[PDB]
Design a protein around this nucleic acid. Structure first.
Lengths: 184, 164, 304, 170
RNA sequence: UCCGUGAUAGUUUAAUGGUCAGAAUGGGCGCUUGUCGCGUGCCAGAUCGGGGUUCAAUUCCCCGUCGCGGAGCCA
RNA sequence: GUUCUAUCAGGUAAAGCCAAUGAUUAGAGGCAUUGGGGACGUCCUCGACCUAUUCUCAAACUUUAAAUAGGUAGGGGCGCGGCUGCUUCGGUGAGCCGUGCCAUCGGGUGCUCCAAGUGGGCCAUUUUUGGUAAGCAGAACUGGCGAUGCGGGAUGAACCGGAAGCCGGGUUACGGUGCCCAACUGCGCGCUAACCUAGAACCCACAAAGGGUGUUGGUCGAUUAAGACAGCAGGACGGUGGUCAUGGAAGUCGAAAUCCGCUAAGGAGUGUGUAACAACUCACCUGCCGAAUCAACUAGCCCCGAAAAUGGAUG
RNA sequence: GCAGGUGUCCUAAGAUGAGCUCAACGAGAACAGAAAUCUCGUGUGGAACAAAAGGGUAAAAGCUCGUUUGAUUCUGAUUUC
RNA sequence: GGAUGCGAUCAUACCAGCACUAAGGCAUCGGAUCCCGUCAGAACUCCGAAGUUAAGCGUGCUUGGGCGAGAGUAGUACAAGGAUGGGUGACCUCUUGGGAAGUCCUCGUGUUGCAUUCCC
């Protein structure tokens, strides 16, 4: 899209403003749908979760969230169909970029004199994706785990902060598959 | 903009109460009356709106100096900066809390002196502590009050803080 | 299901909670205001408490003289209209003359001339009088002020008769006369001003003579006969009694006492768990089952 | 919590809290509050002015102003009203107007009742006669000091309401 | 690009004290007249876009799109 | 000044407040119009849209509880006798005066007169707020430069050592010991061969996302003399030119379906075919060979990504 | 630097005392939708306090009712400044 | 062992549910000519006992959801002092002194001071 490159906004550096009722003029959020796949089920038929977890705590751009998701999402449909299992994206775009926008070209850019000077018109937004947070969380059934794994591998080339694929487990999938049937 | 001291400016503990302290305070605090030389905290109840000092004072411990009708004068010393003086604060008893530390202390002093009397009629520990006390001339106090309120206009912290 | 009332309370818990600990038991019961309390208490004049409605009411009255201390308040003397027939009196214990005499009984009882320490001159008794506009010596009132409680300043009224019985009792309680129950409104004699009557002891006397059936034992003068016996000087009571057998007791207390937790929650929980595993339907409140074993835990295992 | 199963009545049985006869129309459309006259006759005591608070969008800017009128009656005066009022709407008729809370209300012109039309300068069609029914103990939610909510235990039921009123002259 | 200056019906253009909005022309309907026109009675606006303050905003603030005027040195 | 008391920065789970946005299970009630029906001599039910309430996943104000952490606050008694107070001709202490009695530091330090440059800073560290950033701007808390030598950092205001009268000798700090340059071409061990590379920090010393059977090392699973992995060599009849579909599959476009007789092994087949028809190999099994093999996590260094201006360097 | 207010408006929009306690939601009232009004039940600070923010408070500081004038004169210890 | 008045601790003192101040130590209750009051005794209030325990006040219990408090279970976040400690860098890290958190179990559906003082 129209340039500003993301490194400038990459660092978790400035104070956090996301307050919609004070912050007027805030533009369109993204992703267009966060959980992709079924929605007639929750976890049931899918006894495997796979995650992508961040090594690096950073502000990831709103369009990068869509871009990483869309590369993953075509791998989901192009290899396992329309109403398959379910993927969840789980860090979302809190951090409104105000920041210098609309420069001019006299011996002013900064039009009033040079100034610039907050009350900046808004540019977009980023998500704070912090260390060990689960950016993508995907419930799947075991043969199609390797399919979700290439999809997460396609996802990681499209945000800045380095991440590792892991098959994710809280109470295993092997205290659940006991504790379930011990209290029934 | 020049600096000030917006007397009402930054106030969240200084006027908010916990969930557990909300609603009207029972009138026993409103009723409580103190004697001179009592050590009492100043720390507003936020749920009483009148008789309050200027908010910066809160969490300091003062000596009850004298009383005027309903509210009391409690003596405190300001802190930080240069050459700072004793100041007296007018506060109603709704924001002024008795020091339990001072009661505990008074008790711990009596306990000590019950033992001093016992151990000086048949007992032994110290010796050296018996030599000071017995000599002294006393008493109260306002020479040593002026002695207190001249180094607490402090010296080296004032020059240290006077440039950065 | 739907349903109202509970649901609009149980979610909004935190509010609850706050409602029970903003004030305590005498305000929760709805008894004592803590803004009138503060008005009257701050000075060390003692509270001249005179209760009479939704309390003890329509049957008896009480006057209590209350001081503050570190432990709680502390009543220094009290009088109940039920002790008022001890001194001879047997006509009604809720009325203006009863209230009046109950206030004398508290006031006579508070000095009673106490303790070593004494005090009966300049000039207690101020007689059981009849009275006009408060004769004292005279200018300053102390060591009792009227705590009306919940009861109103309603002009010419029985709380003021209790106040008047305090005044003619050797208590001095603050006053000015411009809503008050004056002289004959106990009965006594009267009257002045925009408020009216010029009879009220002696209420019932006017009524009784308007003929009809009511209580036995006569007439207007039977106020006078035993107001006159309550004019006499005779401190003090209460009382002599035999103490007390063993123990506590009582058949009411007993079929209520004592404790049972822990054990009884364990007997009931056992009953509940046995009731579940023999059926399984619903629990206590309100749902679940497939198939449980107590308490918060069962719900977490029935999701996934 | 309905505790019925004992050995019962006289505190349990229903009584009349109140009958409120209320008009709602407004000023100007019929008048000052002239169907006060009609209320005055039907009930037997004078109605008291209704002002409003809050919103209208529709004429009715003045706020503080006369708009309505009411008579809250009770003792014999409420019952005496019921007898005349009770017989006019027809009977019988119907569970729906009762709330579960055990009160019931109806409309009709003040001109219904024995009464002269001739005395009422205006008649006006309708507005609630409301009958508040309750048990003796109400006085706890009403009285000032020791207010306590009325429990499920105390609160009148439509069934109970229908019965006690169906017991009498309809 | 800075400091100044406006906008109200199809079009040109009045106006207020915070509670109330106009005119002329143009146009829509009759009558003139054989028919048009000249003339004669009749009619009809989210006060630029925009948010805020207030008991009540066409009217009082702030921003902006446009149309205007006036400045912008010693190179 | 550690220890006692207070209460407070603070920002994660929860509560009130509010929440963008997308992912929703169970289940009551709103509204609208339409469609269908049995039950019975209208009713009632059902369906097409919304909302309770059970309610999961993720930041955001206040409060808990902060945990924190620095702060930040604070470290004589009795009796006798007179006089007094405020608040019933009423109850009390407190105040006052008089008189007696009994009780881990270590000059870091008070007051007065008169005078100075100021009354424009900087940097580093920590915590920040703005700003893409900046040898930016603007604060907080502190140490230094300014106004501080001397020794180390090639040079070097503020990094390290270090705070200095002068001199003399001794030993050291930081840092260093191949030469330039005093002093080790020191010891035990291991990795690298790119001249990586001789570097705390720096506007100054670059190197990323991503990739790498380079090499070492650690671990786990499975496979092995009941002979593996690889290579080379050798065995495969018949049902039946497999059912669908389609010019056409018929092993070999696309899609069923993958069994068995006859058998010691012998899949309705792994890649090469002709428009389509036409052959060869191969699954599995066997020999020859003889010893480890394969899979997979994890980690180091190196390698790669890696283009700039008069002449080559880590001084 | 973010966010946003005051340069007014008030003799009642002050004072006190008695007396009352919400906003709001459900259920009920022919007509009325804006529909007040009238009723019942639940109802703790979510309401209400002229005005920012914020914080406060439920027989109140909030509500209702009467009365009242202390928005009186003169003085000020002390805090802020 | 304790109901009745006035209060302290003001989220261990709740929402909800089940026994009890009580033949002469309460509230419901009755009269309202009345003081008082309302529109209307409903509230308010002079007067007062025939009923009631049925409540309210409050007494024996119920932890159920709520929560104080604590026990295990999440040493995890976070942060003070110091490092020629690592990393290209955002960043981490050792050391020194500190250390919330959710779940489960648990205790808890009061406590305390003055009154009037009571059936046994």
């Amino acid at each position: 899209m129209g340039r500003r490159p993301a490194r400038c906004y990459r660092q978790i550096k400035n104070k956090p403003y996301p307050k919609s009722r004070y912050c007027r003029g805030v533009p369109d959020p993204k992703i267009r749908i966060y959980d992709v796949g079924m929605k007639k089920k929750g976890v049931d038929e899918f006894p495997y979760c796979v995650h992508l977890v961040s090594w690096e705590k950073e502000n990831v751009s709103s369009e990068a969230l869509e871009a990483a998701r869309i590369a993953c999402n075509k791998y989901m449909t192009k290899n396992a169909g329309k109403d398959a299992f379910h993927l969840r994206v789980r860090v979302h775009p809190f951090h409104v970029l105000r920041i210098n926008k609309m420069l001019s070209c006299a011996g002013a850019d900064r039009l009033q004199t040079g100034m610039r000077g907050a009350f900046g018109k808004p540019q977009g937004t980023c998500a704070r994706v912090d260390i060990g947070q689960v950016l993508l969380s995907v419930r799947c059934k075991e043969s199609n785990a390797k399919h979700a794994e290439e999809a997460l591998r396609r996802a990681k080339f499209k945000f800045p902060g380095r991440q590792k694929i892991i098959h994710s487990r809280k109470w295993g999938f092997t205290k659940f598959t006991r504790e379930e049937y011990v209290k029934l | 903009m020049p600096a000030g001291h917006g007397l009402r400016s930054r106030t969240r503990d200084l006027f908010a109460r916990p969930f557990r302290k909300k609603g009207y305070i029972p009138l026993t605090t409103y009723l409580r009356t103190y004697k001179v030389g009592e050590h009492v905290d100043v720390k507003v109840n936020g749920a009483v709106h009148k008789g309050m000092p200027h908010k910066f004072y809160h969490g300091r411990t003062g000596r009850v100096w004298n009383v005027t009708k309903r509210a009391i004068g409690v003596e405190i010393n300001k802190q930080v900066g240069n050459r700072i003086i004793k100041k007296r604060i007018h506060v109603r008893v709704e924001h002024v809390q008795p020091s339990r530390c001072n009661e505990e202390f008074l008790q711990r002093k009596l306990n000590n002196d019950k033992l001093k009397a016992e151990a000086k009629a048949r007992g032994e520990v110290i010796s050296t502590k018996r030599q000071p006390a017995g000599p002294k001339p006393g008493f109260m106090v306002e020479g040593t009050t002026i002695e207190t309120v001249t180094p607490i206009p402090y010296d080296v912290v004032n020059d240290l803080k006077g440039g950065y | 299901m739907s349903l109202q009332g509970g649901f609009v309370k149980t979610q909004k818990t935190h509010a609850y909670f706050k409602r029970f600990q903003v004030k305590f038991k005498r305000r929760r019961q709805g008894k004592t205001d803590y803004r009138a309390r503060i008005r009257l208490t701050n000075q060390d004049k003692n509270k001249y408490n005179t209760p009479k409605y939704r309390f003890v009411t329509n049957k008896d009255i009480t006057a209590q003289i209350v001081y503050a201390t570190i432990a709680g308040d502390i009543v220094m003397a009290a009088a109940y209209s039920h002790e008022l027939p001890r001194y001879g009196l047997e006509v009604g214990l809720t009325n203006y003359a009863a209230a009046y005499c109950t206030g004398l009984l508290l006031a006579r009882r508070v000095l009673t001339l106490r303790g070593l320490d004494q005090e009966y001159e300049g000039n207690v008794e101020a007689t059981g009088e009849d009275y006009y506009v408060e004769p004292a010596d005279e200018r300053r009132p102390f060591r009792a002020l009227l705590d009306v409680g919940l009861i109103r300043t309603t002009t010419g009224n029985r709380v003021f008769g209790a106040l008047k019985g305090a005044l003619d009792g050797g208590l001095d309680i603050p006053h000015s006369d411009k809503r008050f129950a004056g002289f004959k409104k106990d009965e006594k004699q009267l009257d002045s001003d925009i408020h009216r009557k010029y009879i009220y002891g002696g209420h019932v006397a006017d009524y009784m003579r308007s003929m009809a059936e009511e209580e036995p034992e006569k007439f207007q003068a039977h106020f006078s006969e035993y107001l006159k016996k309550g004019i006499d000087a005779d401190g003090m009571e209460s009382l002599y009694k035999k103490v007390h057998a063993a123990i506590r007791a009582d058949p009411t207390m007993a079929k209520s006492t004592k404790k049972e937790p822990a054990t009884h929650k364990r007997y009931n929980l056992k009953k509940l768990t046995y009731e579940q595993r023999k059926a399984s339907l619903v629990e206590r409140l309100n749902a679940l089952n497939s198939s449980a074993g107590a308490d918060d835990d069962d719900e977490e295992e029935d999701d996934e | 919590m309905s505790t019925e199963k004992k050995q019962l009545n006289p505190m349990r049985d229903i009584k009349v809290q109140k009958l409120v006869l209320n008009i709602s129309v407004g000023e100007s459309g019929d008048r000052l509050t002239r169907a006060s006259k009609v209320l005055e006759q039907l009930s037997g005591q004078s109605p008291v002015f209704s002002k409003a608070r809050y919103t209208v969008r529709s004429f009715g800017i003045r706020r503080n102003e006369k708009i309505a009128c009411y008579v809250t009656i009770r003792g014999e005066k409420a019952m005496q009203l019921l007898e005349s009022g009770l017989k006019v709407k027809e009977y019988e008729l119907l569970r729906r107007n009762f709330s579960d809370t055990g009160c019931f209300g109806f409309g009709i012109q003040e001109h219904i009742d024995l009464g002269m039309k001739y005395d009422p300068s205006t008649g006006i069609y309708g507005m609630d006669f409301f009958v508040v029914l309750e048990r003796a103990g109400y006085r706890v939610s009403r009285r000032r000091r020791c207010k306590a909510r009325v429990g499920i235990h105390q609160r009148v039921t439509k069934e109970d309401a229908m019965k006690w009123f169906q017991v009498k002259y309809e």
